[PDB]
Amino acid sequence: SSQGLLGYYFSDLNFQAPMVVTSSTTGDLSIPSSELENIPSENQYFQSAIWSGFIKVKKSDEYTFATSADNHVTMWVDDQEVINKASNSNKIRLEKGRLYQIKIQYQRENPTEKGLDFKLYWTDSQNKKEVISSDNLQLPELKQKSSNSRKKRSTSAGPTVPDRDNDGIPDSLEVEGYTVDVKNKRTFLSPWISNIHEKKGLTKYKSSPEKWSTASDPYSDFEKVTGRIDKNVSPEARHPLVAAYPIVHVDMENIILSKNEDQSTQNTDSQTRTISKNTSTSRTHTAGFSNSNSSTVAIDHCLSLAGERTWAETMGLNTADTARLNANIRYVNTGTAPIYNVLPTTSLVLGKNQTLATIKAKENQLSQILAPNNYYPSKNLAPIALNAQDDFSSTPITMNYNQFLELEKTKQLRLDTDQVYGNIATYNFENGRVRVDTGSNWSEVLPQIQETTARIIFNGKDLNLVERRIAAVNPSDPLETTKPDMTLKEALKIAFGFNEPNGNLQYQGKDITEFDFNFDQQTSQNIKNQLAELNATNIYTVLDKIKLNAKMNILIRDKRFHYDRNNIAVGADESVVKEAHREVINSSTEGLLLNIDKDIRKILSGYIVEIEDTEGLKEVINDRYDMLCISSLRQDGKTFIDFKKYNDKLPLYISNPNYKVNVYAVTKENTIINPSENGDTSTNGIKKILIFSKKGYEIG
Ligand SMILES: [Ca+2]
Ligand SMILES: [Ca+2]
């Protein structure tokens, strides 16, 4: 349980040096020395302490309060002192259902025991005395605004530990650095100490003492580090310097095109003449400073239907007909916080700006959460059809004849999704629960997050673009200057899980030098200036010295690949592609069996197989632009390149053992997706990469 009173335990006598900040479920406010391993022995002596929260009683009555050390205690119930350095029997009247503020201060110089043994009791009218039970105690209202029943500030009477933003973490800890450690029941927040915490691999937190959420998101610095937060929030965004917010795009998995019924045609019994294709969708980035969500859909160009007809020929579309599109999609959350009750609206766009459809889900009628690193619907469930089978009111996604031809030519669609994400599930200090709060909305949060953080977009996870935002100083905004300095190195560690085992920063085994850096213009000039000030000629050797600022944009990409203007991986150097195909497991006249890196496979559209005779002439076996999909990933994760698929199901016939079998890879950026202007559907002129070449006698 995360409920109870909030305690600050200080090594000094005057509430200045907080050693532990933690909560207690019951009136037992003790911290035994056995729980103090993350703090120096000499600091395990607590000379002062402050507790705060509320008391709720289940039964109106007159109660008497008392503690383990009334001679060292002053206690207030709603601004009223009930204990002052003396035990008493003064009976204060408490009404059922009503919430009373509690503040307790304790001071004792030169304690002879480490830790603190301290209990809060009360006695009712029937002379029954007990340690106050957990059902009667609540945390203070550590929010930016008071509740109707719970005031956000403690009584003005007595000591006030500096907590300028009311998040619960004392100013001094947020500025100087703190660590969070878990017991079995409780989280201790303590000052960072180099020689003890660094070796334990603990995380060193700093945050702004004047920003309740330092990332300007809806979860407080204290809520984050103490686990008083939506469990669906990404682990990295439990750091007060990492922004927690949703990021959504749409993934289209496949498409079906068909001819629209028309009033003039009474006949609806004709044969099916649809065009069904698989599609590949990637979230894009156009270095940029737009906070837009967009994804681009590539429609499969591989052979699907008999013949080499035009799409219009296939569907029987005349120049006056219209065509319809249906598709299967899912929503993808690549951000750091969940969505509960509004999915963002999406435009489906042909060419630069021809909106074909507006895709909307029903507000407050979501079938599940849309969680970070997850899909809606979940992958274990059917996807959403744009025109659902049940749904009478799904709008047809229609194209006129020329739009249809444009789609055939480009084989591309774009999905632009807005940033309307609905209500937020927040922590409630009254009951220690997380629930969707109707009074909290992502639209009130996103602008501030964007304005006060540096954005890093990184593709090291499967070459897909993942955006994170990290709290970073704005030298021009006084409030933002109260945040800790954020270095480029630290940002990569906390936002993306880079680590540094041997003084080299790595992402899952890959050195940082295996990725490039790309910035928007303002950011570029900023970083260039820093490097010059540092007398540094190479960014990779000074990542710990490069400071991020709010509104920076940083794009970091795997160096092995070529990228299009949407920053999607579309190719790779010849040398990289060749090497990636080096180790052959098996070869025969039936095909090749290779092990290919998963990332490499992502940028290949297909393979061309060829037999080269003794005079140097070449027979291309699968000699069509739509016949290059001859590779498949097997269960054992190896790739098979199938020579027979487009050889009429026959093994390669090699007339002479000195003939060669040549296999070439074709990257996405070099892929032909239409017949040439002259109508040629062959592979002639395709830019291709030789990846295997062996003579007949070397194959078998
Ligand atoms: Ca604070
Ligand atoms: Ca703070």
Rg value, the chain, Cα:
33
> What's the 75 CA to ligand 2 centre distance in angstroms?
27
- Using the 8-state DSSP alphabet, how is residue 503 labeled? S
| HSE-up of residue 519 (Cα within 13 Å, Cβ side) | 15
Distance (Å, whole) CA 16 – CA 553: 39
Enumerate residues 6+ apart whose C-beta is below 8 A from 24. Answer: 4, 5, 7, 30, 51, 137, 186
- DSSP β-ladder status, 453-458 and 553-558: parallel
619 within 8 A of 683, measured Cβ to Cβ: no
> What's the 15 CA to ligand 1 centre distance in angstroms?
15
Per-residue tokens: 616:
């140097």
Task: Identify which ligand lies nearest to the alpha carbon of 208.
Answer: 2
Task: Identify which ligand lies nearest to the alpha carbon of 215.
Answer: 2
> What's the 100 CA to ligand 2 centre distance in angstroms?
26
Per-residue tokens: 694:
């062996």
| HSE-up of residue 511 (Cα within 13 Å, Cβ side) | 7
Q: Taking the CB of residue 163, how many other CB atoms lie within 10 A of it?
A: 22
Q: Does 544 belong to an annotated binding site?
A: no
Q: Does 163 belong to an annotated binding site?
A: yes
Distance (Å, whole) CA 203 – CA 421: 31
213 within 8 A of 220, measured Cβ to Cβ: yes
The number of helices, as runs of H, and strands, as runs of E, in the chain is 10, 41
Distance (Å, whole) CA 200 – CA 198: 5
Range 42-81 burial, b when 16+ CB lie within 10 A, else e: ebbbbbbbbbbbbbbbeeebebbbbbbbbebbbbbbbeee
User: Which strands form 553-558's sheet, in the order they lie side by side?
Assistant: 466-471, 453-458, 553-558, 515-519
> What's the 191 CA to ligand 2 centre distance in angstroms?
15
> What's the 219 CA to ligand 1 centre distance in angstroms?
13
Technique of determination? X-ray
Site of tokens 């005031």:
151
Q: Does 12 belong to an annotated binding site?
A: no
333 within 8 A of 245, measured Cβ to Cβ: no
Q: Which domains does the chain have, with CATH numbers?
A: 1-244 (3.90.182.10), 245-450 (2.60.120.240), 451-569 (3.10.20.110), 570-700 (2.60.40.810)
The torsion defined by the Cα of 119, 124, 127 and 133, in degrees rounded to 10, comes to: -40
> What's the 489 CA to ligand 1 centre distance in angstroms?
26
Distance (Å, whole) CA 332 – CA 246: 10
Q: Is 226 left (phi over 0), alpha (psi -120 to 50) or beta?
A: alpha
Site of tokens 């800890």:
173
> What's the 651 CA to ligand 2 centre distance in angstroms?
69
Site of tokens 């039970």:
133
- Using the 8-state DSSP alphabet, how is residue 189 labeled? E
State in Å, rounded, how far the first CA of the chain is from the last one.
69
Per-residue tokens: 445:
């949060």
The three-state secondary structure class of 436 is: strand
Per-residue tokens: 95:
């009404």
Q: Please name which of 415, 385, 373 lies closest in space to residue 250, comparing C-alpha atoms.
A: 415
Site of tokens 């090749």:
592
The three-state secondary structure class of 426 is: strand
Enumerate residues 6+ apart whose C-beta is below 8 A from 309. Answer: none
Which amino acid is present at 399?
A: M
> What's the 447 CA to ligand 2 centre distance in angstroms?
19
The three-state secondary structure class of 394 is: coil
Q: Please name which of 465, 462, 122 lies closest in space to residue 296, comparing C-alpha atoms.
A: 465
431 within 8 A of 372, measured Cβ to Cβ: no
Per-residue tokens: 279:
């599609």
Discontinuities in the chain with C to N beyond 2.5 Å fall right after 286
Per-residue tokens: 75:
């206690």
Distance (Å, whole) CA 58 – CA 94: 10
> What is Dmax (Cα atoms) for the chain?
111
Distance (Å, whole) CA 89 – CA 318: 96
Per-residue tokens: 225:
């580090």
Q: Is 698 left (phi over 0), alpha (psi -120 to 50) or beta?
A: alpha
572 within 8 A of 625, measured Cβ to Cβ: no
Distance (Å, whole) CA 438 – CA 415: 29
Which amino acid is present at 458?
A: F
Task: Name residue 418's beta-bridge partners.
Answer: none
Element (H or E) spanning 333, and its range? strand 322-333
> What's the 295 CA to ligand 1 centre distance in angstroms?
39
Q: Taking the CB of residue 195, how many other CB atoms lie within 10 A of it?
A: 7
Element (H or E) spanning 660, and its range? strand 660-667
Distance (Å, whole) CA 363 – CA 551: 32
Q: Does 167 belong to an annotated binding site?
A: yes
Range 467-502 burial, b when 16+ CB lie within 10 A, else e: bbbbbbbbeeeeebebbbebbbbbbbbbbbebeeee
> What's the 144 CA to ligand 2 centre distance in angstroms?
11
Q: Does 699 belong to an annotated binding site?
A: no
